Design a protein around this ligand. Structure first.
Ligand SMILES: O=C(O)c1ccc(Nc2c(-c3ccccc3)nc3ccccn23)cc1C(=O)O
Length: 438
C-alpha cells in the first residue's frame, strides 16, 4: 500500500484485527532501523514505560522529550527523566493562555537514514493498550551524500514544511533536528503536513497553520466536482472545546468553510461529527476509565447543547474496533454515498478553536493556542481523482484508502448522550463491573 496509515494494536480483539496494526515496540524495533537518536514529541509521558519500549540495545541512545509542561508539572517530568542520563527535555513555549503541546511525533535517526512518525497516542501504557489510535509512517529517508547539493524535497513540500514547523519552537534542541532533516532526502513523501503552532498569524503567514493551512491545500491541490455541495464533511475526535453559543460562531462559519473548500474558484453540505456516546464508553473494552481520555467537561457542554445534534456514535466494525474507544482524530470528505473520499486527514487536532485557530481582528488574523500536527492524504498526490473507501480495513486494489471506522456514521439515538467526563454514571455498570464517580 502507498498510504502507510496504521492503527495501533488493541489487546483483546481477534488476531485478524491486529495483523496490520503496530505497537510502539514494533515502531522502535531494530527491523525499522538501527537507532542513533530519537525525539519524542508528545503531551503526556510515562518515562519508565517509554524507555522499556525501546529495544534493550537502544535504551541508552539519546532521547529528546518535547513537551509543554510548566511549573510543578514540568518538575514532575524532569523528575521522571533524571534517572536516565541519555534523556534531554525541550519545553515548548506556550505564550498564549490555555494552549497545550498536543503534537505526537517521533523523529528516529538511524545509521541507515531517518524516519518520521506522526501519530495520535500519548506515551503511556493505556494509550497503546485498548484504544483506536492512528499512525503515519514515513519512508526510510536516505542521507544526502556529503558534497552533493540537492533539495531532498517532495512534491508535497513536506521537508520544508516540517522544518518550518520545528523552526516555530525557536528551540536549540530542535535546531539540531532541523540540521538532521536538512541532510536527508525526503523526496518520496506523498502526504502534506498540516500543523498548528501558537501565535497570531496575518498576511503571508495566515495560510501557514490550522484550518487556513488546510483550506490553502484544498484550494491548491484538490478539484471541485459537480454536486460538491452533496459531499459531506466528517470530523472525528476525542475532545471538544467551547465552540460558542450557536453553530454560526465558529463551527459552521469558518471551520466548516475551510473543510468544504475544493479547488480554486469561489452551505447545505452535511456535517457529521463522530464522538463516543456514554453507551459507547460504558460497553468499551476499558469501560468507563476510557472516558478519562475523552475530556469533555459538563461546564463546556451545557453552553453548547446545539452541538450534540451533530453527534454520531463510534462504530468501527470494519477494523474490529467498535469497543476500542477512539483517541485518533480524523477528518475527511466522502462522496454522498460514502464510497469515495476526496481527502483524508489524521491529526492530533480535536474539535476546538485552540487547535484549529479562530479568526480575530475583523477576519485578518488567525489565532492558534496549541501545537498540533497531522498529515493530509490528497488523491492528486497519488495520481488519482479520488480514493475508493476500503470495505474492510485489514483486507485486500491497493489504491483504496483504509478508513478505520464505519460509514455512514450512525446518529445518536434519542436516549444517547455525549460522553462527559466529570459527571457520574451510576445507572448501569461497565465491562469491568464498575460505575463512574468523578
Ligand atoms: O487528544 C485528546 O483527547 C487530549 C485532550 C486534552 C488534553 N489535555 C488536557 C487535559 C487533560 C488532563 C489530564 C488527562 C487528560 C486530559 N485537561 C485539559 C484542560 C484544558 C486544555 C487541555 N487539557 C490532552 C489530550 C491528548 O491526548 O493529547
Amino acid at each position: 500500500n502507498p498510504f502507510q496509515f496504521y492503527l495501533t494494536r488493541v489487546s483483546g480483539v481477534k488476531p485478524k484485527y491486529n495483523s496490520g496494526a503496530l505497537h510502539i515496540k514494533d515502531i522502535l524495533s531494530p527491523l525499522f532501523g538501527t537507532l542513533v537518536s530519537s525525539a519524542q514529541f508528545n503531551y503526556c509521558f510515562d518515562v519508565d514505560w517509554l524507555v522499556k519500549q525501546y529495544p534493550p540495545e537502544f535504551r541508552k541512545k539519546p532521547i529528546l522529550l518535547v513537551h509543554g509542561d510548566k511549573r510543578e508539572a514540568k518538575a514532575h517530568l524532569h523528575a521522571q527523566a533524571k534517572p536516565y542520563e541519555n534523556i534531554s527535555l525541550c519545553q515548548a513555549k506556550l505564550d498564549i493562555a490555555f494552549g497545550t503541546h498536543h503534537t505526537k511525533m517521533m523523529l528516529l535517526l538511524y545509521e541507515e537514514g531517518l524516519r518520521v512518525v506522526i501519530h495520535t497516542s500519548n506515551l503511556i501504557h493505556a494509550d497503546w493498550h485498548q484504544k483506536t489510535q492512528g499512525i503515519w509512517l514515513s519512508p526510510l529517508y536516505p542521507r544526502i551524500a556529503d558534497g552533493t547539493h540537492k533539495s531532498g524535497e517532495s512534491p508535497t513540500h513536506f521537508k520544508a514544511d516540517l522544518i518550518s514547523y520545528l523552526m516555530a519552537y525557536n528551540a536549540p534542541s530542535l535546531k539540531e533536528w532541523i540540521d538532521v532533516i536538512h541532510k536527508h532526502d525526503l523526496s518520496e513523501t506523498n502526504v502534506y503536513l498540516i500543523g498548528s503552532t501558537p501565535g497570531r498569524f496575518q498576511g503571508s503567514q495566515k495560510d501557514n497553520w490550522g484550518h487556513f493551512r488546510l483550506k490553502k491545500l484544498l484550494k491548491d491541490h484538490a478539484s471541485s466536482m459537480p454536486n460538491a455541495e452533496s459531499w459531506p464533511v466528517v470530523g472525528q475526535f476525542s475532545s471538544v472545546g467551547s465552540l460558542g453559543a450557536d453553530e454560526s460562531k465558529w463551527l459552521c462559519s469558518e471551520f466548516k468553510e475551510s473543510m468544504l473548500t475544493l479547488g480554486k474558484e469561489s452551505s447545505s453540505v452535511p456535517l457529521y461529527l463522530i464522538y463516543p456516546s456514554v453507551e459507547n464508553v460504558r460497553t468499551s473494552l476499558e469501560g468507563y476509565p476510557a472516558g478519562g481520555s475523552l475530556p469533555y467537561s459538563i461546564q463546556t457542554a451545557e453552553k453548547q447543547n446545539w452541538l450534540h445534534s451533530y453527534f454520531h456514535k463510534w462504530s468501527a466494525e470494519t477494523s474490529g474496533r467498535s469497543n476500542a474507544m477512539p483517541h485518533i482524530k480524523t477528518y475527511m470528505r466522502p462522496s454522498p454515498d460514502f464510497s469515495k473520499i476526496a481527502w483524508f486527514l489524521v491529526t492530533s487536532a480535536n474539535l476546538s478553536k485552540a487547535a484549529w485557530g479562530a479568526l480575530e481582528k475583523n477576519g485578518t488574523q488567525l489565532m492558534i493556542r496549541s501545537y498540533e500536527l497531522g498529515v493530509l492524504f490528497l488523491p492528486s498526490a497519488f495520481g488519482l481523482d479520488s480514493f475508493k473507501v476500503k470495505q474492510k480495513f485489514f483486507a485486500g486494489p491497493m489504491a483504496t484508502f483504509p478508513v478505520p471506522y464505519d460509514l455512514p456514521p450512525e446518529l445518536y439515538g434519542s436516549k444517547d448522550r455525549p460522553w462527559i467526563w466529570n459527571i457520574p454514571y451510576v445507572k448501569a455498570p461497565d465491562t469491568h463491573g464498575n460505575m463512574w464517580v468523578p
